[PDB]
Design a protein around this nucleic acid. Structure first.
Ligand SMILES: [Zn+2]
Lengths: 27, 67, 77, 112, 19, 58, 39
RNA sequence: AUGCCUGAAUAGGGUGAAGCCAGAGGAAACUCUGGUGGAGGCUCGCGAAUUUGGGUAUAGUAGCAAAUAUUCAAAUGAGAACUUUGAAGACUGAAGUGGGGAAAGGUUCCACGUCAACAGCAGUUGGACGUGGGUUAGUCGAUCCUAAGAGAUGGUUUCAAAGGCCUGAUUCAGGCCACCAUCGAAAGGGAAUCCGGUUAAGAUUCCGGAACCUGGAUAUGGAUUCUUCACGGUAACGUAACUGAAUGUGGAGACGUCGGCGCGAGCCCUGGGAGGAGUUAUCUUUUCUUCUUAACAGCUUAUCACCCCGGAAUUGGUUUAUCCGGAGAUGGGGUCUUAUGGCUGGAAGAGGCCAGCACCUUUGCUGGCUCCGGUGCGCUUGUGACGGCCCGUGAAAAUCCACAGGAAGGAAUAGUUUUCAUGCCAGGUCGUACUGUCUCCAAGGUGAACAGCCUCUAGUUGAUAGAAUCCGUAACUUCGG
RNA sequence: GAACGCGCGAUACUCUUUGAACGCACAUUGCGCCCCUUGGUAUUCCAGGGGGCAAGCGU
């Protein structure tokens, strides 16, 4: 469960600990 | 829902997801010309909002349903 | 709920403008002497509480029944 | 011999949620959550429990009259009787010592 | 303490240039 | 009758507690026969005071 | 059955109760009562 | 490897350290005997190791996917070892194969229809397929607050012009104050809801009854007693009220762990009686089961602590535990907190257990009883006064209250205040169905040595199938009066 | 570009929630301030609608 939904792109790539997206870089 | 209408004096409606209890009470009062005692809202799994509107004892819910 | 002991307070409560009905409840129960008796509870609710007057005397209860307003709905038991 | 459990969201045996077991008018055992006990107000000088002041939760003091949370004496409701007595005696003696010291200074500077 | 707050930076600079 | 806390401890913590106790016993037995394990007070006694050290030098 | 502490507590409590009752009744004065208390 | 914040757990048996009490020896010091008390690098089931949640830093062959035990009759169905009902046998045995939760999953919950595929045989079954139904909150959580830490502004308050308030016959002048956004806990802090009933599937949410919390505007009664912010008691303190600015403080929130003692409630045990069920070849006043009282509200109720009198060695009081007294003991008389019990309202009208009378049907009507007690090295839980040890005097903030202070205001056809009483109105958004690495509840009998064996309530019958200490003595020995 | 809905956006075969994304936060459909207006007894309360908020003593 290291990743969650990203608001900007909709993928399961939002790292919960880092608070950054590994697919689109949000934010 | 029709059982609730017949017995509990409760009209069951589907409402928008952007409406609160104040707006539902006001809308029922304006559209159907009845006095609302209470409003209880829930959010259904399919993304829609259901409201139970219990009217005051001065009004019969079945009469409004037939109307 | 609240318990009252004053009969005239009960009558004043039953004389208010916004009063729906009054309940008269009968209970058959024993006293400390063992002789059974009839106890009458007069219950009427005010604004936010239910006041109960308990009367263990049959005659006093009958007089209170007679003294109730004729326009007051009375629930027997 | 009926088993009961919590009635709220918390499933852990924390201080916040504590359970008592009561027999309801239905003839069954059921759980009930108990609130935290109130603490007696304490004196601001010695820390002893204040006498004559009701013990309530912090927000329950806002709904009771002033006689239930004060004492008619000075500092009543904040300090106890003995502390007030010591304060009075100490203040008076300090004032007397100030007067005596001022007289002594006046005398010792009066030589010149 | 730190009383320097009584003078804003521009006032302090324009008085320093005076000296 | 066994108490509730005893039941919970024996079901949860008994095994690892016993294992740790055995490990401490084994380590103590192994270190007892070795040389070079002395407490701070024992080492302080062995070194001695400044006067004792100056006497030992002399 | 009953452990040592429970029976000791009961014995000491009943002995002290009897001593206090006897002193209050006047059968024993302060000093004999004080000796019997420690004994 | 070392941390830090906030929770859960840190149990049990044995042994018996200081200190204390009473005896015996000696001039003391000191040594023995018994009890008490209940401690630890005590035991039992340079190096290794040292519970846990959340948060946060440095070939039609092998073989049947293994978790035991099934049998008889009936029903449904084209078809039954596998579906359904009844009977029999067996299993889990409160540390559950029992009832809930956090996280996670996402319709798996319920009904109807179906067996093309899936559930390694079959299936009429389903956590499958198709169509529908289902989750209701002022009171339960989130929402609010801050913790370790993170992070904008000019690295975390720093050489930042970083902001609010008050006074004034109209003159824009004057004055006060200091210090940094924000995020971070569904286990921490926190205002308030209970009982009964109800569905195919929803409940502290719906229904019936009953009650609280917060905020607001206002009216009435009473008080504010000569007209202007009330009294009583030596005192602790009591009260239906009984104004209070700047400013300065105090309390609750709010805080380590262990031990025994006292008290309350739930469970267990148990006597009588009033019902119902089982067994009864013989015996058995016999075995099982019902006899319940919620939140909330009124009256009353306290160990500790404190106050007044009094002035003590012939030293007294006193705890299971040796501490207290001219720094005022013993004794006598009072004050307080309401924790917790008792009575009552809620409330018997509810629920429970019975019996009788109605019908191819929602087919519900009536009548009784729901009472009185005891017991504790028992289990669970809360609480009070103590004692021991470790230690920053043992997280912070939101929030509520109080005290010092004396600014200001108050009277003649409604003076000022309304922490006294009654009365009116309102309470938004999101989660709630179902299951379930951390967590909650927890009966009895035998064991007479934690263990193991058997059962009550409640759940199962799942797994391809068929064939081959104990007998005789004596002294003693418990509570009161 | 994404999410949710009927090529399109509640006017859905005008333009919802977002996104450089802009009132503040954000893994919450969470929390504010300002102006106008309307309704429910209404000067106070509650709610609905519309529109917004990324001086110096130097000369
Ligand atoms: Zn004090």
């Amino acid at each position: 469960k290291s990743h969650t939904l990203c608001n900007r792109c909709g993928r399961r790539s939002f790292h919960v600990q880092k608070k950054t997206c590994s697919s689109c870089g949000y934010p | 829902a029709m059982k609730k209408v017949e017995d509990g004096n409760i009209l069951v409606f589907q409402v928008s997801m952007k409406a609160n209890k104040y707006q539902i009470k006001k809308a029922v009062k304006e559209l159907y010309e009845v006095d609302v005692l209470k409003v209880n809202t829930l959010v259904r799994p399919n993304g829609t909002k259901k409201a139970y509107v219990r009217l005051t004892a001065d009004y019969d819910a079945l009469d409004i349903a037939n109307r | 709920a609240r318990e009252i002991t004053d009969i005239k307070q009960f009558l004043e409560l039953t004389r208010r403008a916004d009063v729906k009905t009054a309940t008269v409840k009968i209970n058959k129960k024993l006293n400390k002497a063992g002789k059974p008796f009839r106890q009458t509870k007069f219950k009427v609710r005010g604004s936010s509480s239910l006041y109960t007057l308990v009367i263990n005397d049959a005659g006093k209860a009958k007089k209170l029944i007679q003294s109730l307003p004729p326009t007051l709905k009375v629930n027997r038991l | 011999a009926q088993r009961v459990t919590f009635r709220r969201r918390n499933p852990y045996n924390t201080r916040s949620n504590k359970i008592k077991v009561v027999k309801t008018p239905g003839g069954i055992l059921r759980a009930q959550h108990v609130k935290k006990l109130a603490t007696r107000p304490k004196c601001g000088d010695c820390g002893s429990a204040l006498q004559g002041i009701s013990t309530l939760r912090p927000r329950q003091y806002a709904t009771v009259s002033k006689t239930h949370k004060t004492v008619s004496r000075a500092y009543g409701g904040s300090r106890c009787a003995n502390c007030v007595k010591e304060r009075i005696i100490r203040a008076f003696l300090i004032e007397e010592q100030k007067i005596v010291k001022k007289v002594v200074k006046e005398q010792t500077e009066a030589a010149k | 303490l730190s009383r320097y707050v009584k003078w804003p930076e521009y006032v302090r600079v324009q008085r320093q240039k005076k000296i | 009758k066994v108490s509730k806390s005893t039941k919970k401890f024996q079901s949860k913590h008994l095994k690892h507690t016993l294992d740790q106790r055995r490990k401490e016993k084994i380590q103590k037995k192994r270190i007892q026969g070795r040389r070079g394990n002395k407490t701070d007070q024992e080492k302080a006694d062995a070194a001695g005071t400044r006067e004792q050290q100056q006497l030992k030098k002399s | 059955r009953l452990p040592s502490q429970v029976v000791w507590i009961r014995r000491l409590r009943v002995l002290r109760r009897l001593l206090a009752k006897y002193r209050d009744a006047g059968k024993i004065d302060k000093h004999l009562y004080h000796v019997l208390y420690k004994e």
